Amino acid sequence: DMHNNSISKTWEGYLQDCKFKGWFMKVCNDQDSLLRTLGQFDSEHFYSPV
RNA sequence: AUUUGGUCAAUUUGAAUACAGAGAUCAGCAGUUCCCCUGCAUAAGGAUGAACCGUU
Fold first, then answer.
1. CB atoms within 10 A of CB A16
2. Nucleotide nearest to A21 (CA to C1')
């Protein structure tokens, strides 16, 4: 039962160079790890911690 | 009171032969245009489905 769960569109933009080689879904144990993963495409800035 | 409205053409001629003059009728199908339905393609544009975790 997940009434708490929800989704929000954070961004809806245009990128100069698309460094994402494919669609590499993942899970990480921590936030730092996630950030690092994101920055594998030289783009940590996508994640919005709230 | 009379009379014109009355010349067959065609051919053989240097009047004779001709004798009215030479496809019909019934029925398909396709095309042309517009419309409607149906299946497919092409573009575009939606809508939606599908277990479960992925990739340095």
1. 5
2. B55
